[PDB]
Structure formats: C-alpha cells, structure tokens
Ligand binder design. Structure first.
Ligand SMILES: Nc1ncnc2c1ncn2[C@@H]1O[C@H](COP(=O)(O)OP(=O)(O)NP(=O)(O)O)[C@@H](O)[C@H]1O
Ligand SMILES: Nc1ncnc2c1ncn2[C@@H]1O[C@H](COP(=O)(O)OP(=O)(O)O)[C@@H](O)[C@H]1O
Ligand SMILES: [Mg+2]
Ligand SMILES: [Mg+2]
Lengths: 269, 293
C-alpha cells in the first residue's frame, strides 16, 4: 500500500523472459545501495513514448499502482524512473496460469479451476474497489504464487502508454473505451481460456474478423467440460451493453457457490 | 484457502447452449408482438450445415434493462435444458444489443387460435389426445423440478393436428431438492394460493392445466369473461368455478373441477391426468358429445 522507489544502479537485468504488447519482462536482480546482495526479481521495462519525457519522475498513476496490495494480485515491489520505466515485482517460478493449465490439462481438479475463477475475481474486485482498471486481463497475465494460489498481473500498465484484441470488449475495440466491465469481458475470456485448458480464443479466425463477428451475435463456444451454468456466466460477461454485465462481487460469489460443489458444474474425467 | 466442499450430489446440467450469428437466419414474417418484444417466423441456415430450418425467432424489446434480459437468460436456460417430444426446445441464441431466442417453428402456431378457427372440424379424439400430450409434457416438466408458472392455451404450440408442445418458460422457475414451493401474472389461470400468497407449486400448474382443458373443451372461450381480475379471488372463496362445457360429460368436468380444488394436494397429479385422459382417449365419443364426428 506504499510505493518504493529504486535507483537504476540498484537494479540489474539478467535474462530476457519475454516481450508483450506494452513492455518487456526481464528476470533480473536487486542490489541495494552499498550492499553486495543479489535478490532475484522481475524487472519489466516500459519505453517512454510520451514525448514529454514521461518517466523521469514518479507520476501517480505510478504510486497508485504501487500502493495496492492484495492476496491475489502481483504486488509491485518498487519502480525505477528514467528514459525507461522499470516495474519490479516478485519472480514467480511457477509461471503463468495459461501455461500451467495447458501442461496439466484435465489432471488439475475441477475444484482448483473453480477456485482460480474465484481468486481471479476477488483480485479484480480489489482492483476495482480501489479504482484501478486493468485493461489487459488474460490467462497469460495470471501468475501462480502457490500451486493453489494465483495472482493478477500487469494491471494499470496500459495507461502508462499513449492511446490483445481477443480479450477486449466491443466498446474497447470500437472506441478505445476501457471500463471495469470491459475488464469483466476480459475476465470471461480468461475463464474461457482456463476451462478449455489453454485454448486460443477465435483460433481459425483473423483479428480483422473478430469484432464484427462479435457484433453479429456469436461468441466463444461452450467449453467441453462446462455445464450450462458455468457457460451462462461467461455469456453474461460477453454482453454488448456494459450495465448488463456482471460485476466482480457477483462473479466471485457465484464462482464461490460453484466451488462449494465442483463436480456439479464442471465435468472432467 | 480453498472453498470447503459441501457436495450437492446433483447431476451437472450438460445442456448445450448453442450461439448463432444473426446472419445465419433471416426474418420472414411477424407471428406475435407485444411489450415483451416480437416473435418472428424465419429461416435458419447453419454454417457449413446446409439444412434450412423453419424457426421462430423471439427478440426482446427492452434490451437495456438488466433483468428484462435476466429473465430472457433464465428463459433460455430452461428452454435449453428440457428435452421432450411435448415440450419445445431451444435451438440456440443470438447475442446482440438484442437477445434473440431461436426455436423450431410450429406451422399451425398457437393452439388457442387453432381450436378457435377450426371450431367444428374437431372431433373428440383430437381434443383428448391434446389433453394427453399436454399432461405428458407437464409431467416431464414436473420431474425436472421446474414449474411452468404460465400454463395456458396461448402457450401451447401446434406442430401437427396430432402433435402439440409446450412453450413460454419466461416465468418458469427451477426448484432445488427440498424446494417444494416457489414464492414470487395471468390471474384467471392461477391457483387460489398463487393469487393470495404468491405460492407456486406443481399443484398450481394443475390448476392452470384444468383451466387450459376448459379452454380447449369450450373451443377457445375466455375464462370468466366479464369478470375482472379484481374479484375472482372472492368468487373462488364462495366455491364458484368455471362452467361445464357443453361437450363435456360429468366425468371430464369432474376431473377439471378437481383441478380447481382449494387444497392443492387434493388436486390430481400429472401422472394421474395422463392415465385418465389416455383411458378416455381410447373411447372419445363416450366422454365428449360432439356430433359432426
Ligand atoms: N512475476 C513474474 N514471474 C515470472 N515470470 C513472469 C512474471 N511476470 C511476467 N513473467 C513472464 O514474462 C513473460 C513475458 O512478459 P510480458 O510480455 O509482459 O507478459 P505477456 O505474457 O506477454 N502478457 P502481455 O504482455 O500483458 O500481453 C511471460 O512469459 C511471463 O511468464
Ligand atoms: N415456434 C412458433 N411457431 C408458431 N408460432 C409461434 C411460435 N412461437 C411463438 N408463436 C406465436 O407467439 C405466441 C406464443 O409466444 P410466447 O412464447 O407465449 O410469447 P410470450 O412469452 O411473449 O407470451 C403464440 O400466439 C404463437 O402464435
Ligand atoms: Mg504479462
Ligand atoms: Mg403468453
């Protein structure tokens, strides 16, 4: 709930982990001032495309991001301002939830899947209750803290850059409008990823075809392991009108209701 | 740090909810309209599948109000969950600004309209058969623990003169195990307790069934016409019920006024109704006097 500030010499980037849409994530290390200790961290480098020379000083979209802590979100250990912004977080070796469900597939219990639905939902609830909009929620951006604990990552990063199509809501695609309920849409797609064990949304199609496809009434199909009750949720997540879509309170509560009976809502053998 | 388990031991609902794009089906004509929205008759052509399926497309008019469509999604849920020759099934939904339920078309449409337009070419053996099919459909609905809170002739569709099905489900509610009653609407079709206490049960749908069979036996007459929704409670408390239809014998009318008993358990069950109307349908001219047969 307090934002720490690093100087650039305290941080060092060891290996590239991967690049995405916004920034590039390095596995790096922290060596504090006047100490010789190396503490393994995750340093995400965001390039300054503001032109105003954006990131030389701490803005508080930045402290806002830095002043959040919840059991099911990735806490931002510290930030480092400069020509490039550096976001330092814990290095979670278990990796992304996407890769996990892709590797273990059905072998994970239905209880785990429903519970992860719940956890992602309460993380997002914490974020929404504190006015934080994610703008990039996906299965790739949910990391495993524990084999049973998941945390939401890459939140608030999107409004660091100036003004992913398969996780975006229609208003987001058409008018660049991002809301907590657009994050709900994204949540629905994320859960779809989860319960299809890491399937690629709208695989056969091309990015051009997706928004119109959505506007013509078609959706991501019902997952093989999904009861009608669970798919109904994703469906209401993917509503065109925003104020119809569920809120995160309710999403968390209903996935909780389901979690209190895993086999009735998911069928895996 | 997991949710602790409390198993229900109830079967998963593996109903398939199919989703279609609006370009897969066309709207030809209007079949019905109102504040609910509009029902269209149209053609569905699935993608890559090349069958042309005559369909009814129900589209909701107040898209923006949340629970107008909460009610549409519950409706879609129920209609996608049922599977029975005498109940209409959902073929899929189209999610747009407007939700559109899509079902298989029934050429002859509303049954009320049918028993009205074809008033004197209708034998006893069609009417009794219709009663049987409806009782069967409602029996299936009963043992899937969902209550059709709006059973009436308006809501029975006609596939062929010999085959009808049940529809709506816009008010229909699912009852869980150890959920005998539902506490919450067409006043002249409801049971007394549904008017006085807002209680709906499977035995309330039996009252609705009785009124329905009365509509059929009177060839589409209006229940309690001239009597307003305001007062009927009182008439029912005086013991007054619907009149005996001119074609009905004392046994048929006995069964239907048995559907309208105050004690809800004293009313017949759909099981019973299937048995008794099947037994009557084996000799129709003995239970209904309609000449022209
Ligand atoms: N805390 C972390 N611990 C371990 N690996 C991480 C962590 N955060 C991010 N990564 C990895 O960083 C890699 C790429 O980073 P990044 O490009 O920001 O994420 P992404 O998967 O591409 N999603 P996005 O960029 O938001 O569209 C992925 O392989 C992640 O597993
Ligand atoms: N599949 C269908 N085939 C023919 N007619 C239909 C069909 N669905 C609805 N209708 C027409 O609409 C009415 C029944 O629709 P219903 O679902 O009861 O609407 P609501 O629920 O708004 O009352 C009937 O009068 C019937 O003529
Ligand atoms: Mg990421
Ligand atoms: Mg109606």
């Amino acid at each position: 709930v307090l934002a720490r500030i690093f100087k650039e010499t305290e941080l060092r980037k060891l290996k590239v982990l991967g690049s995405g849409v916004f920034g590039t994530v390095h596995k790096g290390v922290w060596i504090p001032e006047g100490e010789s200790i190396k503490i393994p961290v995750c340093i995400k480098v965001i390039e300054d495309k503001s032109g105003r020379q954006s990131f030389q000083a701490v803005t508080d979209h930045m402290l806002a991001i830095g002043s959040l802590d919840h059991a099911h979100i990735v806490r931002l250990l510290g930030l480092c301002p400069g020509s490039s912004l550096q976001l330092v977080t814990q290095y979670l070796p278990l990796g992304s939830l996407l890769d996990h469900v892709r590797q273990h597939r059905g072998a994970l219990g239905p209880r785990l899947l429903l519970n992860w639905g719940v956890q992602i939902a309460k993380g997002m609830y914490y974020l929404e209750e504190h006015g934080m909009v994610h703008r990039n929620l996906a299965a790739r951006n949910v990391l495993l803290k524990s084999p049973s604990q998941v945390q939401v990552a890459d939140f608030g990063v999107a409004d660091l850059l100036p003004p992913p199509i398969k996780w975006m809501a229609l208003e987001s695609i058409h008018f660049g409008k991002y809301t907590h309920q657009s994050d709900v849409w994204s949540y629905g797609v994320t859960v779809w990823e989860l319960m299809t064990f890491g399937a690629e949304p709208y695989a056969g199609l091309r990015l051009a075809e997706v928004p119109d496809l959505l506007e013509k009434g078609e959706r991501l199909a019902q997952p093989q392991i999904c009861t009608i009750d669970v798919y109904m949720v994703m469906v209401k997540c993917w509503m065109i009108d925003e104020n119809i879509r569920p809120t995160f309170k309710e999403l968390a509560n209903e996935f909780t209701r389901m979690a209190r009976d895993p086999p009735r809502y998911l069928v895996i053998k | 740090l997991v949710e602790p388990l409390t198993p229900s031991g109830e079967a998963p609902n593996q109903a398939l909810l199919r989703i279609l794009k609006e370009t897969e089906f066309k709207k030809i004509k209007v079949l019905g309209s109102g504040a609910f929205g509009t029902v269209y008759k149209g053609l569905w052509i699935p993608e890559g599948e090349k069958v042309k399926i005559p369909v009814a497309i129900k589209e909701l008019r107040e898209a923006t109000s949340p629970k107008a469509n909460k009610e549409i999604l519950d409706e879609a849920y129920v209609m996608a969950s049922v599977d029975n020759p005498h109940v209409c099934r959902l073929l899929g939904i189209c999610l747009t600004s407007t939700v559109q339920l899509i079902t298989q078309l029934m050429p002859f449409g509303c049954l009320l309209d049918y028993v009205r337009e074809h008033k004197d070419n209708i034998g006893s053996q069609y009417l009794l058969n219709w009663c049987v099919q409806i009782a069967k459909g409602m029996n299936y609905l009963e043992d899937r623990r969902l209550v059709h809170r709006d059973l009436a002739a308006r809501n029975v569709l006609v596939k062929t003169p010999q085959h009808v099905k049940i529809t709506d489900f816009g008010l229909a509610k699912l009852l869980g195990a150890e959920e005998k009653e539902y506490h919450a609407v067409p006043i002249k079709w409801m049971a007394l307790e549904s008017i006085l206490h807002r209680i709906y049960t499977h035995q309330s749908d039996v009252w609705s069934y009785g009124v329905t069979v009365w509509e059929l036996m009177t060839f589409g007459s209006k229940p309690y016409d001239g009597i307003p929704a305001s007062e009927i409670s009182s008439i029912l408390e005086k013991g007054e019920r619907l009149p005996q239809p001119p074609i009905c014998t004392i046994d048929v009318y006995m069964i239907m006024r048995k559907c309208w008993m105050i004690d809800a358990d004293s009313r017949p069950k759909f099981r019973e109704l299937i048995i008794e109307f099947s037994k009557m349908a084996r000799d129709p001219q003995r239970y209904l006097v309609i000449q022209g047969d």
